[PDB]
């Protein structure tokens, strides 16, 4: 039967505070600007730190010391006046100051447009003049020539006065404004303004009335009284939040708020004294204005006039400045490679582990007889007495820690590992996860965190384990995969060779082959056929191959032994490649499953490293092989250049043409020497059995590393072999003379100097790039954060198709890569006629995708977030596969964040690119701005030469016709009537995303944005699923604008969320009422981010003061729907394991 409870907060209300409420907050009034006594250092009575008001300095102990124990609790000492309770209450209890004269709150005055000003219909200047005593503003005349609610001159004020008593009166300062606020009746005024909106004029009248009505209605509904914007009682913050404390040295340190409060109290008390002493009006005016200034300074410092300063060098910290985590059980250290580790493990230093796990260790040492009690356990453990170690081993058993490396760009920046205690001070990290952390061992450090609860630990072991996240949430490709040495090893053992030494051996199976390979006569593999049984065919569990003897290599034979156990014998023996190894791992993941693939990954690592070490791969100066052709090509280039010089001095060609020809000649020469380098390494001669010379790829280290994908690029390789090239000037122009030298030879000082510029520009680029990429990531996170998978399905077939995306070549960037992991929107069918392909409302699968590929090319159709009709989110089918773990995204997954991190993470790779990506995500109206996106579908050309408005042009659809006014200059591809293209877009320059939205609708914008973003990443060769970009685009298209109200309360031109107008429209239409007609609105990620309704989130984003004043005025309530609100609250977020909990609550509340 109702009644108050504990915690269980379901809502937060914000409102203007009445003086009554402010006094209800107050335990006592602070009457003195005293702090503490100079001698006793105890709090001065009735001052800012007084114990009678805020609380006892010491727990359960009154000031004079009469009552020192918890025996008395709630008791108030008769002698000293102090209640006996916990001193903690000094953080909670609040005071107040009673102002002798009202003072207007600064936020509701100086923030533009002023809320007080807007309510009272007073311009900033007038409100300033009245509040700060410059002029009197006549109020409530109810007759006479003089205008009510208007200002006046003193001589005028008097002259007027003479003409009538009990007429319009007005007292300068906050008293007048408070009077206007109390006396104004909002009901009557909304009535009047509503009558005013009837006025026949089209513009300038209805809009203003609409804004005024907006504010008025805000006040009407909220229930707050306008006069509350003027303060009578000014609240006083608890002392512990503005402390005066003794530092280490015995010196005192104080929060600036204490000083601000002191100025306030001083001026207020002095004002009371001056009033009681019947001071002249000039002095009382000065004091009142000073008081207003002091309150101003206390609330916001610097908003109005010069900010108050302790000293000129620093300004005081006001409440506004105050308004706008570090963790326990955490550590950090330098990281080192841990090759011997399993993917789910990490090396954790013993000392670190002893500190991190100390309470658990105490508990366990108490459970076992190792110590009598926790205290004894601690005293013992610091000693480090033996068996404490074994106990620590017992403690961390099955337990997992979190490892994190800054910057955390995506969710794999934090992963869970099972700790292996190790001697030494370094954290040992597994090599396969270095990619995901972007971690290397040149001195990087990582932080460790200990999940405490069973719930947290379960979250870590299930959701966060490195071994459970083997593939990128962005591209769906493996994230934890072999890199560097591993590849080098595998490639070394899987290499074609003349193989004269070990050729012609039947393996007797992988086992005997392995024995012999380790034995003798086999080195760097061999051209020998192996007997191993292969198979593992699927569509049946039986598997098995009757005969499996195939040409192979000792390393190749070895690989099959290494637990592949998932077919692809053909894939083996094809020689190792980094890309090939990644593909092998992925295929193994799909066919053979996750756990077993993890084991496969570990095996591939182990073997890769093992052979990598014994390969003997190294780099000598002679391993950088120059081409004899270089001197020839250089001589040729010199000759051609001389020919161009002679041809120039003749006057046949311009300076420009000559420059261009020189640059081109040199470019081609650089290509030539590159080719020569790569050719020289690429072919080699070795003796064949018969005696013939065979041509092998070669095992040269630069070449081997390059070909294997272990390390290197052709451009880099040519830098030690072939002539360097052309340098850029700082202006960007290309120097005439190239760098003939190559790093093996070494280059002249001038060449190096002329380089330093490029080098410097590079480092500066990367350094700035981290900062910019971070910003993009944060914008995307802020815009997409509320998105979550809210249900399995929403019931709409609607979706997009998507094309091959290749502009001309058509070769790459299409088909299954784009299609895979999606859901079919329609019963798509393979080939002409009979058709009947079997996937409808079905998640695309690799086997199914292969089916679609086999049956020629498919036009295709697909479920997408863009077309998802789910209210306040997306659904499992429309999203498709969770790319980190092949399956339909588990309900409750927070898609938005994942999207933001997926797009944001390779930000530093785009280079400065990234500005283009941000330009697209922010929906900028591109400068060239073109195309006649009129969709009238008809055309009648015209004129009316009025500058830009000259061209004009008219479309003439059979039903109706319209007129658009263009701009001088430019050209058109289609001219004069006939409506050549219904799409039109006659002018060149790329349509604005907004123009594209109005003319072509939502689907076209989703297509355009996704493809145009993808162009950038592709140009940088980065793999990213369209899905995330679709999430973000969906957030961009969130807003809609009403064209016709219908039967609803909504106004024409009013903007509102898609979901809200859809729900409303279904309500009306199912209620038999005319639905609202609406038009799609597209806003960039910034504007969308700034859009969100909840005030805790918004205020925690940016622009805290504005958000908080508007919220407080409107009397808003935060329902805690999103993540930010709950995080701030310290609540369990409505996502993941929390998503399940949140729903039950939401339902219970409704």
């Amino acid at each position: 039967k109702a009644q108050t409870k504990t915690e269980e907060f379901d809502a937060i209300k914000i409102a203007l505070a009445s003086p009554d409420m402010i006094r209800s907050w107050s335990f006592g009034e602070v009457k003195k600007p005293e702090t503490i006594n100079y001698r006793t250092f105890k709090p001065e009575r009735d001052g800012l730190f007084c114990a009678r008001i805020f609380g006892p300095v010491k727990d359960y102990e009154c000031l004079c010391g009469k009552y020192k124990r918890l025996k008395h609790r709630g008791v108030i000492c008769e002698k000293c006046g102090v209640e006996v309770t916990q001193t903690k209450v000094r953080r909670e209890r609040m005071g107040h100051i009673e102002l002798a004269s009202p003072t207007a709150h600064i936020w509701f005055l100086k923030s533009l447009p002023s809320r007080i000003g807007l309510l009272l219909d007073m311009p900033l200047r007038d409100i300033e003049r009245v509040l700060y005593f410059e002029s009197y503003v006549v109020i409530e005349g109810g007759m006479t020539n003089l205008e009510r609610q208007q200002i006046l001159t003193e001589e005028q004020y008097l002259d007027a006065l003479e003409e009538f008593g009990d007429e319009f009166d007005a007292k300068m300062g906050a008293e007048a404004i408070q009077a206007l606020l109390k006396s104004m009746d909002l009901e009557q005024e909304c009535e009047q303004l509503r009558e005013e909106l009837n006025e026949t004029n089209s513009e300038t009248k209805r809009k203003k009335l609409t804004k005024r009505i907006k504010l008025l209605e805000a006040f009407v509904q909220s229930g707050n009284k306008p006069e509350w914007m003027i303060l009578t009682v000014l609240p006083v913050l608890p002392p512990d939040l503005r402390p005066l404390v003794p530092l280490d040295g015995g010196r005192f340190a104080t929060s600036d708020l204490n000083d601000l409060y002191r100025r306030v109290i001083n001026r207020n008390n002095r004002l009371k004294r001056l009033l009681d002493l019947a001071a002249p009006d000039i002095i009382v005016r000065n004091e009142k204005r000073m008081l207003q200034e002091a309150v101003d300074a206390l609330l916001d410092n610097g908003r109005r006039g010069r900010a108050i300063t302790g000293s000129n060098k620093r300004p005081l910290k006001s409440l506004a400045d105050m308004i706008k985590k570090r963790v326990d059980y955490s550590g950090r250290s330098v990281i080192t490679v841990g090759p011997y580790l399993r993917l789910h493990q990490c090396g954790l230093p013993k000392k670190m582990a002893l500190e991190l796990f100390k309470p658990f260790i105490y508990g366990k040492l108490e459970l076992r007889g190792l110590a009598t009690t926790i205290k004894a356990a601690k005293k013992m453990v610091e000693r480090e007495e033996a068996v404490v170690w074994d106990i620590l081993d017992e403690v961390i058993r099955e337990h997992p820690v979190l490892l994190n490396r800054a910057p955390t760009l995506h969710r794999l920046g934090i992963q869970a590992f099972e700790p292996v205690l190790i001697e030494g001070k370094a954290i040992q990290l597994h090599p396969l996860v270095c990619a995901a952390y972007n971690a290397d061992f040149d001195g990087d450090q990582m932080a460790v965190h200990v999940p405490l609860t069973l719930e947290a630990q379960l979250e870590a072991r299930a959701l966060m384990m490195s071994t459970n996240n083997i593939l990128s949430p962005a591209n769906g490709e493996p994230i934890i995969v072999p890199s560097q040495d591993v590849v080098l090893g595998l490639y070394y053992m899987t290499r074609d060779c003349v193989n004269a030494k070990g050729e012609g051996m039947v393996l007797t199976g992988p086992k005997e082959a392995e024995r012999l390979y380790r034995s003798g006569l086999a080195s760097l593999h061999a051209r020998v056929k192996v007997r191993i049984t292969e198979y593992e065919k699927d569509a049946n569990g039986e598997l098995v191959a009757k005969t499996s003897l195939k040409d192979t290599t000792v390393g190749r034979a070895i690989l099959w032994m290494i637990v592949p156990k998932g077919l692809p014998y053909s894939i083996v023996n094809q020689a190792l490649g980094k890309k090939a190894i990644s593909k092998m791992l992925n295929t193994c993941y799909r066919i053979l499953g996750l756990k077993p693939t993890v084991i496969f990954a570990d095996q591939i690592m182990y073997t890769g490293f093992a052979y990598a070490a014994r390969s003997g791969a190294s780099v000598g100066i002679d391993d950088m092989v120059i081409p004899e052709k270089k001197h020839e090509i250089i001589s040729e280039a010199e000759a051609e250049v001389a020919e161009i010089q002679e041809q120039f001095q003749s006057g046949l060609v311009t300076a420009g043409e000559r420059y261009n020809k020189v640059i081109d000649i040199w470019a081609a020469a650089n290509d030539r020497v590159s080719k020569a380098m790569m050719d020289n390494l690429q072919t080699e001669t070795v003796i064949n059995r018969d005696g013939q010379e065979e041509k092998q790829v070669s095992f040269n280290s630069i070449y081997m590393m390059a070909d294997s994908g272990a390390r290197g690029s052709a451009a880099q390789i040519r830098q030690l072999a072939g002539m360097r090239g052309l340098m850029a000037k700082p202006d960007g122009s290309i120097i005439e003379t190239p760098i003939t030298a190559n790093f093996r030879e070494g280059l002249n000082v001038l060449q190096y100097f002329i380089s330093t510029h490029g080098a410097r520009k590079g480092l500066a680029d990367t350094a700035l790039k981290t900062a910019n990429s971070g910003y993009l990531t944060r914008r995307l996170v802020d815009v997409a954060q509320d998105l979550v998978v809210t249900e399995d399905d929403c019931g709409t077939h609607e979706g997009i198709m998507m094309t091959p995306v290749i502009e001309g070549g058509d070769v790459k960037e299409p088909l299954r890569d784009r299609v895979l992991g999606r859901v079919t929107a329609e019963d798509v069918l393979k080939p002409g006629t009979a058709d009947i392909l079997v996937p409808r409302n079905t998640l695309l699968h690799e086997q199914w995708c292969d089916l679609l590929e086999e049956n020629s090319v498919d036009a295709v159709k697909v479920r997408s977030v863009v077309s998802c009709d789910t209210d306040f989110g997306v659904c499992a089918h429309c999203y498709g596969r969770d790319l980190a773990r092949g399956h339909i995204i588990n309900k409750g997954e927070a898609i938005g964040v994942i999207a933001a991190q997926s797009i944001g993470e390779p930000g530093t790779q785009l280079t400065m690119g990234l500005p283009r990506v941000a330009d697209l995500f922010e929906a900028r109206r591109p400068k060239e701005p073109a195309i006649l996106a009129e969709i009238s579908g008809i055309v009648s050309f015209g004129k009316e030469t009025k500058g830009k408005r000259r061209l004009v042009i008219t479309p003439v659809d059979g039903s109706d016709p319209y007129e658009e006014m263009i701009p001088k200059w430019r050209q058109l591809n289609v001219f004069e009537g006939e409506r050549v293209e219904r799409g039109d877009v006659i002018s060149d320059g790329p349509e604005a995303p907004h123009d594209i939205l109005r003319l072509r609708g939502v689907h076209a914008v989703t297509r355009y944005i996704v493809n145009e973003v993808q162009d950038v990443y592709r140009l940088q060769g980065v793999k990213i699923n369209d899905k995330h970009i679709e999430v973000i685009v969906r957030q961009m298209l969130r807003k809609a604008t009403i064209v016709n109200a219908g039967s609803s309360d909504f106004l024409e031109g009013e903007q509102v969320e898609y979901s809200r107008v859809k729900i409303a429209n279904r309500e009306l239409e199912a209620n038999g009422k005319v639905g609202a007609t609406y038009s799609r609105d597209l806003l960039g990620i910034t504007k969308a981010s700034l859009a969100t309704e909840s005030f805790i989130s918004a205020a925690s984003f940016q622009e805290t003061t504005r958000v908080l004043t508007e919220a407080a005025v409107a009397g808003k309530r935060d329902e805690l729907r999103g993540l930010k609100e709950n995080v701030i609250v310290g609540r369990l977020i409505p996502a993941g394991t929390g998503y399940a909990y949140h729903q039950d609550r939401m339902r219970r509340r409704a």
Partner: peptide, 7 residues
């Protein structure tokens, strides 16, 4: 030269 026409 290398990166940035440097490298």
């Amino acid at each position: 030269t290398x990166x940035f026409x440097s490298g």
